[PDB]
RNA sequence: CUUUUGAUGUUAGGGUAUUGGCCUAACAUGGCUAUGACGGGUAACGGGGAAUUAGAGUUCGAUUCCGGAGAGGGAGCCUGAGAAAUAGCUACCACAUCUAAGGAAGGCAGCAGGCGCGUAAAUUACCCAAUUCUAAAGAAGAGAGGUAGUGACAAGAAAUAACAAUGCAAGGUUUGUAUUGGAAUGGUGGGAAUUUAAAACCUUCCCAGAGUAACAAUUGGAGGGCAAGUCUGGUGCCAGCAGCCGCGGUAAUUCCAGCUCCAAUAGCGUAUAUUAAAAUUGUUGCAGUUAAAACGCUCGUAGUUGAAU
């Protein structure tokens, strides 16, 4: 059959590049943020 | 200059000709003191006319500064030091130096001896 | 040969990794006591858990069995030292009743937060890492450090901190001072 | 009665029955028969290196409808021919018709996986570059 | 099964450092075995131990110590207190180096290093300073040993902010979160102090030294199992994913993307094996009318079990 179709869909899809984001928090800070989102003010 | 040396497990030893001790240098705030000053202090403490019967080693400065442990060795006279200190320590002190490049191509040379009536 | 310097795992993983309730609890703990991972929590659990196991074992033996009296007593003493029990609750049935909060309380960062020093838990942690804080003579820059009740009172800003009396001594404050001087001249 | 003997001096019977019966356990048999080393391409190993012999399609199990892209490869170790499914949206063409492929299991010991009929192997490196890396593409490009 | 070829024993010897079929001679006909002899297999060196277990257990143990064995393969010797030695020797076999072709030497399962094999593994480093050994025994040697180098095998600790103002938010005034802005600090760079056999690290101090603190966190997921989207486009039983069930036949919460979220996080995936999960090997602790499973039936040896006193 067809090995011609191998890599169809990916090729078809339009390359939208990532974009700038606010450099994420990491470790402790991130955890703190998560906590805040979940329990503290919303609770 | 604001640094006390407290001298711990001090041990006279007349089998050798030395006093051993552990040696803690309290120097709160102003961190690290060079060996020379310590030696001088030691000399002052123990009358000890000449500075270079003192051998210091193993000065670890401990986490946070402020304190600093070591090992003091103090010999009777320089002759004694010469006799039973290992050469490296002596060299470090500054009593001697042989900068002899024996190497371990010495070993190679040694094994290149097959039949000897050899200067060569 | 190999070295003989033997080493050991301080923390076991969960078992069931996406149980909701447990996860939530862990998160809460993290929030309260300013911890970096679930790993810290796990480590503390392990620490607690060993002790608990020991206690359980001791309880399986009867009183005035030598082992029970000696080892059990030792355990109790250790707990007391750690600041886990104190006066009222020193009977070996009580050392089972320890939970994670009891242990986390005695972390250095938590202690710092309690005893003024910093506005927050997070703040306290950063202070500890940034070479301030001392626990009786010795500086300490690990927030995990389980403070023993013998050395709880002897906690403050270290001798060599900017805010323990030893110059602004920073990249920041010093720089600012320099700038000011330049402006003046 | 229990079925088993529960005598104090019964141990011989108890051991012996267990020893014979263990072999009914499929998993145990798989572990402890010697045919493992004989009748297995990887010959008791995690991965294996095989040069490719044929880029080939394999039609899936009846309910699902796809032609899954496999690679019939020859193990250098063993001289064994095996089909290895290649992952990725378009990762058959990332390999050459003769490339030194490094192929792993599929996840189920020998047993075959998912839609595929009797392909027990997952190519996961070509010319020493990681298939996954190539798929991502931001990481790497196939050297040749 | 073992026994002409010592198998089992007795006698006498020979031999050994000594006991012994260890070997010889002579004489018995023994010895082992269903409590598995004798074979076969082991991807087997043994043990101390390792992993994993509530408790049992199951697997692993080439590998820090002890023991055994071997120095390409067998065999044979010399020396010596001790070797059937291998950086001793003799011989053959199998590899293989130099040679002026006559001969000659050679043995990394020492340390590095190289090729090969491979899924799969580091420097032709520095030193005897420590630990030890050997010696004509401080003073010499030691790839034994140690020190660095490579090292995401594992193991431990731990950054990637914090804080305060207003602005905005919600809650019964406080927490939370967008502007500003002074404090904190490692990292990184350079000096020292020390460290060390000499350096390098560690720690230590002094100069340098963050705001997009570009000093930029990843990995794998978001239908269920299972924490997290019926968010946006692309594809259209194709490509693909999917450990399993399943998703895809133009609304795909499953493909390909982007965004957002979730987990664990300087780690996180995949594979093969293994333990637990497995009371799915069941001694504890399974099941056998119908789910796999009571021998057609009885007798019966070993086996297991055996009234009370
Ligand atoms: Mg400082
Ligand atoms: Mg005879
Ligand atoms: Mg073997
Ligand atoms: Mg072993
Ligand atoms: Mg082997
Ligand atoms: Mg060899
Ligand atoms: Mg030999
Ligand atoms: Mg050799
Ligand atoms: Mg030979
Ligand atoms: Mg080698
Ligand atoms: Mg490796
Ligand atoms: Mg020595
Ligand atoms: Mg070595
Ligand atoms: Mg869910
Ligand atoms: Mg997968
Ligand atoms: Mg869509
Ligand atoms: Mg997606
Ligand atoms: Mg199991
Ligand atoms: Mg169980
Ligand atoms: Mg069953
Ligand atoms: Mg039936
Ligand atoms: Mg019947
Ligand atoms: Mg009977
Ligand atoms: Mg009875």
CSV table of N, CA, C and O in Angstrom, one decimal, chain C residues 22-74:
chain,number,residue,atom,x,y,z
C,22,UNK,N,-5.2,13.2,49.2
C,22,UNK,CA,-3.8,13.2,49.6
C,22,UNK,C,-3.1,14.3,49.0
C,22,UNK,O,-2.3,15.0,49.7
C,23,UNK,N,-3.3,14.5,47.7
C,23,UNK,CA,-2.6,15.6,46.9
C,23,UNK,C,-2.9,16.9,47.5
C,23,UNK,O,-2.0,17.8,47.7
C,24,UNK,N,-4.2,17.1,47.8
C,24,UNK,CA,-4.7,18.4,48.3
C,24,UNK,C,-4.1,18.7,49.7
C,24,UNK,O,-3.6,19.8,49.9
C,25,UNK,N,-4.0,17.6,50.5
C,25,UNK,CA,-3.4,17.7,51.8
C,25,UNK,C,-2.0,18.2,51.7
C,25,UNK,O,-1.5,19.1,52.5
C,26,UNK,N,-1.2,17.5,50.8
C,26,UNK,CA,0.2,17.8,50.6
C,26,UNK,C,0.3,19.3,50.2
C,26,UNK,O,1.2,20.0,50.7
C,27,UNK,N,-0.5,19.7,49.3
C,27,UNK,CA,-0.5,21.1,48.8
C,27,UNK,C,-0.7,22.1,49.9
C,27,UNK,O,0.0,23.1,50.0
C,28,UNK,N,-1.7,21.8,50.8
C,28,UNK,CA,-2.0,22.6,52.0
C,28,UNK,C,-0.8,22.7,52.9
C,28,UNK,O,-0.5,23.8,53.3
C,29,UNK,N,-0.1,21.6,53.1
C,29,UNK,CA,1.1,21.5,53.9
C,29,UNK,C,2.2,22.4,53.4
C,29,UNK,O,2.8,23.2,54.1
C,30,UNK,N,2.3,22.3,52.0
C,30,UNK,CA,3.3,23.1,51.3
C,30,UNK,C,3.1,24.6,51.5
C,30,UNK,O,4.0,25.4,51.8
C,31,UNK,N,1.8,24.9,51.4
C,31,UNK,CA,1.3,26.3,51.5
C,31,UNK,C,1.7,26.8,52.9
C,31,UNK,O,2.2,28.0,53.1
C,32,UNK,N,1.4,26.0,53.9
C,32,UNK,CA,1.4,26.5,55.2
C,32,UNK,C,2.9,26.7,55.7
C,32,UNK,O,3.2,27.7,56.3
C,33,UNK,N,3.7,25.7,55.4
C,33,UNK,CA,5.1,25.7,55.9
C,33,UNK,C,6.1,26.0,54.8
C,33,UNK,O,7.3,25.6,55.0
C,34,UNK,N,5.8,26.7,53.7
C,34,UNK,CA,6.7,27.2,52.7
C,34,UNK,C,7.8,26.2,52.1
C,34,UNK,O,8.9,26.5,52.1
C,35,UNK,N,7.3,25.1,51.7
C,35,UNK,CA,8.1,24.0,51.2
C,35,UNK,C,8.2,23.9,49.7
C,35,UNK,O,7.3,24.3,49.0
C,36,UNK,N,9.3,23.4,49.1
C,36,UNK,CA,9.6,23.5,47.7
C,36,UNK,C,9.0,22.4,46.8
C,36,UNK,O,8.7,22.7,45.6
C,37,UNK,N,8.8,21.2,47.3
C,37,UNK,CA,8.3,20.1,46.6
C,37,UNK,C,7.3,19.3,47.4
C,37,UNK,O,7.0,19.7,48.5
C,38,UNK,N,6.9,18.2,46.9
C,38,UNK,CA,6.2,17.2,47.7
C,38,UNK,C,7.3,16.3,48.3
C,38,UNK,O,7.1,15.6,49.2
C,39,UNK,N,8.5,16.4,47.7
C,39,UNK,CA,9.7,15.6,48.2
C,39,UNK,C,10.0,16.0,49.6
C,39,UNK,O,10.2,15.0,50.3
C,40,UNK,N,9.9,17.2,50.0
C,40,UNK,CA,10.2,17.6,51.4
C,40,UNK,C,9.3,16.9,52.3
C,40,UNK,O,9.7,16.4,53.4
C,41,UNK,N,8.0,17.0,51.9
C,41,UNK,CA,6.9,16.4,52.7
C,41,UNK,C,7.1,14.9,52.9
C,41,UNK,O,7.0,14.4,54.0
C,42,UNK,N,7.5,14.3,51.8
C,42,UNK,CA,7.8,12.8,51.7
C,42,UNK,C,8.9,12.5,52.7
C,42,UNK,O,8.8,11.5,53.5
C,43,UNK,N,10.0,13.3,52.6
C,43,UNK,CA,11.1,13.1,53.5
C,43,UNK,C,10.7,13.2,55.0
C,43,UNK,O,11.1,12.3,55.8
C,44,UNK,N,9.9,14.2,55.3
C,44,UNK,CA,9.5,14.4,56.7
C,44,UNK,C,8.6,13.2,57.1
C,44,UNK,O,8.8,12.8,58.2
C,45,UNK,N,7.8,12.7,56.2
C,45,UNK,CA,6.9,11.6,56.5
C,45,UNK,C,7.8,10.4,56.8
C,45,UNK,O,7.5,9.7,57.8
C,46,UNK,N,8.8,10.2,56.0
C,46,UNK,CA,9.8,9.1,56.2
C,46,UNK,C,10.4,9.1,57.6
C,46,UNK,O,10.5,8.1,58.3
C,47,UNK,N,10.8,10.4,57.9
C,47,UNK,CA,11.5,10.6,59.2
C,47,UNK,C,10.5,10.2,60.3
C,47,UNK,O,10.9,9.5,61.3
C,48,UNK,N,9.3,10.7,60.2
C,48,UNK,CA,8.2,10.5,61.2
C,48,UNK,C,8.0,9.0,61.2
C,48,UNK,O,7.8,8.4,62.3
C,49,UNK,N,7.9,8.4,60.0
C,49,UNK,CA,7.4,7.0,59.8
C,49,UNK,C,8.3,6.1,60.5
C,49,UNK,O,7.8,5.2,61.1
C,50,UNK,N,9.7,6.3,60.4
C,50,UNK,CA,10.6,5.4,61.0
C,50,UNK,C,10.4,5.3,62.5
C,50,UNK,O,10.3,4.3,63.2
C,51,UNK,N,10.2,6.5,63.1
C,51,UNK,CA,10.0,6.7,64.5
C,51,UNK,C,8.8,6.0,65.0
C,51,UNK,O,8.7,5.3,66.0
C,52,UNK,N,7.7,6.2,64.2
C,52,UNK,CA,6.4,5.6,64.4
C,52,UNK,C,6.5,4.1,64.4
C,52,UNK,O,6.0,3.4,65.3
C,53,UNK,N,7.2,3.6,63.5
C,53,UNK,CA,7.5,2.1,63.3
C,53,UNK,C,8.1,1.6,64.6
C,53,UNK,O,7.7,0.5,65.1
C,54,UNK,N,9.2,2.3,65.0
C,54,UNK,CA,10.0,1.9,66.2
C,54,UNK,C,9.0,1.9,67.4
C,54,UNK,O,9.1,0.9,68.2
C,55,UNK,N,8.2,2.9,67.5
C,55,UNK,CA,7.3,3.0,68.6
C,55,UNK,C,6.3,1.8,68.7
C,55,UNK,O,6.1,1.2,69.7
C,56,UNK,N,5.8,1.5,67.5
C,56,UNK,CA,4.9,0.4,67.3
C,56,UNK,C,5.6,-0.9,67.8
C,56,UNK,O,4.9,-1.7,68.5
C,57,UNK,N,6.8,-1.1,67.3
C,57,UNK,CA,7.6,-2.3,67.7
C,57,UNK,C,7.7,-2.4,69.2
C,57,UNK,O,7.5,-3.5,69.8
C,58,UNK,N,8.0,-1.3,69.8
C,58,UNK,CA,8.3,-1.2,71.2
C,58,UNK,C,7.0,-1.6,72.0
C,58,UNK,O,7.0,-2.4,72.9
C,59,UNK,N,5.9,-1.1,71.5
C,59,UNK,CA,4.6,-1.3,72.1
C,59,UNK,C,4.2,-2.8,72.0
C,59,UNK,O,3.6,-3.3,72.9
C,60,UNK,N,4.6,-3.5,70.9
C,60,UNK,CA,4.4,-4.9,70.8
C,60,UNK,C,5.1,-5.7,72.0
C,60,UNK,O,4.5,-6.6,72.5
C,61,UNK,N,6.3,-5.2,72.4
C,61,UNK,CA,6.9,-5.7,73.6
C,61,UNK,C,6.2,-5.2,74.9
C,61,UNK,O,5.6,-4.1,74.9
C,62,UNK,N,6.3,-6.0,76.0
C,62,UNK,CA,5.7,-5.6,77.3
C,62,UNK,C,6.7,-4.6,78.0
C,62,UNK,O,7.8,-4.5,77.7
C,63,UNK,N,6.1,-3.9,79.0
C,63,UNK,CA,6.9,-3.1,79.9
C,63,UNK,C,7.8,-4.0,80.8
C,63,UNK,O,7.6,-5.2,81.0
C,64,UNK,N,8.9,-3.4,81.2
C,64,UNK,CA,10.1,-4.0,81.9
C,64,UNK,C,10.7,-5.2,81.1
C,64,UNK,O,11.4,-6.0,81.7
C,65,UNK,N,10.5,-5.3,79.8
C,65,UNK,CA,11.4,-6.0,78.9
C,65,UNK,C,12.5,-5.0,78.7
C,65,UNK,O,12.2,-3.8,78.5
C,66,UNK,N,13.7,-5.5,78.7
C,66,UNK,CA,14.9,-4.6,78.8
C,66,UNK,C,14.9,-3.7,77.6
C,66,UNK,O,15.1,-2.5,77.7
C,67,UNK,N,14.7,-4.3,76.4
C,67,UNK,CA,14.7,-3.6,75.1
C,67,UNK,C,13.8,-2.5,75.1
C,67,UNK,O,14.1,-1.3,74.7
C,68,UNK,N,12.5,-2.8,75.5
C,68,UNK,CA,11.4,-1.8,75.5
C,68,UNK,C,11.8,-0.6,76.4
C,68,UNK,O,11.6,0.5,76.0
C,69,UNK,N,12.3,-0.9,77.5
C,69,UNK,CA,12.6,0.2,78.5
C,69,UNK,C,13.8,1.0,77.9
C,69,UNK,O,13.7,2.2,78.0
C,70,UNK,N,14.7,0.4,77.3
C,70,UNK,CA,16.0,1.1,77.0
C,70,UNK,C,15.6,1.9,75.8
C,70,UNK,O,15.7,3.1,75.8
C,71,UNK,N,15.4,1.1,74.7
C,71,UNK,CA,15.3,1.7,73.3
C,71,UNK,C,14.1,2.7,73.3
C,71,UNK,O,14.3,3.8,72.7
C,72,UNK,N,13.0,2.2,73.9
C,72,UNK,CA,11.8,3.1,73.9
C,72,UNK,C,12.1,4.4,74.6
C,72,UNK,O,11.7,5.5,74.1
C,73,UNK,N,12.8,4.3,75.8
C,73,UNK,CA,13.1,5.4,76.6
C,73,UNK,C,14.0,6.4,75.8
C,73,UNK,O,13.7,7.6,75.8
C,74,UNK,N,14.9,5.8,75.1
C,74,UNK,CA,15.8,6.6,74.2
C,74,UNK,C,15.1,7.4,73.2
C,74,UNK,O,15.3,8.6,72.9
